[PDB]
Amino acid sequence: ADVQQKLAELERQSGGRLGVALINTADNSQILYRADERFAMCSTSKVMAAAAVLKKSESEPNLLNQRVEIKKSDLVNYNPIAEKHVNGTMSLAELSAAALQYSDNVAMNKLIAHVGGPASVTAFARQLGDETFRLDRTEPTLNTAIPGDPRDTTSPRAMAQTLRNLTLGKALGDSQRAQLVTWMKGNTTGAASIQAGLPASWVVGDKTGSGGYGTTNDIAVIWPKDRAPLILVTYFTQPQPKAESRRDVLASAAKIVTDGL
Numbered sequence: 001a002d003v004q005q006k007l008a009e010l011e012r013q014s015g016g017r018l019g020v021a022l023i024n025t026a027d028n029s030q031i032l033y034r035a036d037e038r039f040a041m042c043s044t045s046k047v048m049a050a051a052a053v054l055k056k057s058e059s060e061p062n063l064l065n066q067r068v069e070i071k072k073s074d075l076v077n078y079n080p081i082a083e084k085h086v087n088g089t090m091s092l093a094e095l096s097a098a099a100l101q102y103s104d105n106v107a108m109n110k111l112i113a114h115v116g117g118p119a120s121v122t123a124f125a126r127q128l129g130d131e132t133f134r135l136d137r138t139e140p141t142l143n144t145a146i147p148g149d150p151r152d153t154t155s156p157r158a159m160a161q162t163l164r165n166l167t168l169g170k171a172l173g174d175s176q177r178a179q180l181v182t183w184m185k186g187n188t189t190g191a192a193s194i195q196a197g198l199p200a201s202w203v204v205g206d207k208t209g210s211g212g213y214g215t216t217n218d219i220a221v222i223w224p225k226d227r228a229p230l231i232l233v234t235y236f237t238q239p240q241p242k243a244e245s246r247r248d249v250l251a252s253a254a255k256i257v258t259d260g261l
């Protein structure tokens with residue numbers, strides 16, 4: 001109740017629309033705020049694409065070593081790793097790491113293409129029991145985040161439950177689960193988001209997202225000091241098409257829902 005009042009106050013001050021889902025595995029409890037509303041995932045969808053590749057690799061052992069050509073024609077709007085590999089190849093493992101740890105959009109497109117496209121990533125989500133996630137488009141258009149548009153959205157509740165399954169549950173084989181967690185723990189883009197609202201000693205694997213309408217997102221698995229793990233999704237979007245990012249709102253939400261732990 002106090003947590004709910006604090007999240008509502010944060011949302012009001014922010015000017016936008018805030019979605020939160022915390023799962024606390026210590027007691028199997030949740031804290032939810034707009035957790036059944038849809039939000040544009042933006043780059044947080046890269047977790048599902050990498051997980052789909054990891055699942056495929058369980059029955060294709062050479063898969064992560066498979067080479068993928070990077071061409072000038074593959075470049076999109078944000079290519080921090082891929083732009084260094086034009087005219088060479090990258091492995092699917094390298095593309096997964098680049099997508100998850102640098103939010104590289106060429107890398108995401110290669111993961112999407114490899115598994116068969118956005119509808120295949122979506123079908124993988126369905127196979128896991130997530131009937132909310134939808135990936136409609138490739139990069140860069142999947143980030144438009146237009147209000148009222150259900151494309152490329154999920155809900156905080158669904159993403160938290162699915163991220164729990166992927167990182168702490170049994171969606172993936174042990175090797176593949178460990179690889180996903182290792183990749184997320186090595187993310188370079190999340191220090192101002194959920195991490196900024198947690199004590200410095202806590203260990204975080206997260207994936208951020210940003211897009212149109214000032215959309216600012218983060219999804220995380222969290223190992224608090226001497227506590228059972230948490231899963232936290234913080235999604236945020238704003239009324240103005242050119243609104244600036246608000247990572248501070250995600251940090252504030254993370255602090256609110258973990259205060260007392």
Ligand SMILES: *[B@@]1([O])O[C]C2=C1[C]=[C][C]=[C]2
Binds near residue numbers: 044077105140210211
């Ligand atoms: B994703 O939300 O993370 C960084 C980025 C994304 C999409 C488009 C451009 C950059």
Ligand SMILES: [Cl-]
Binds near residue numbers: 199
């Ligand atoms: Cl601290």
Ligand code: NA
Binds near residue numbers: 155158
């Ligand atoms: Na989801």
Ligand code: NA
Binds near residue numbers: 190192193194196218
């Ligand atoms: Na973070």
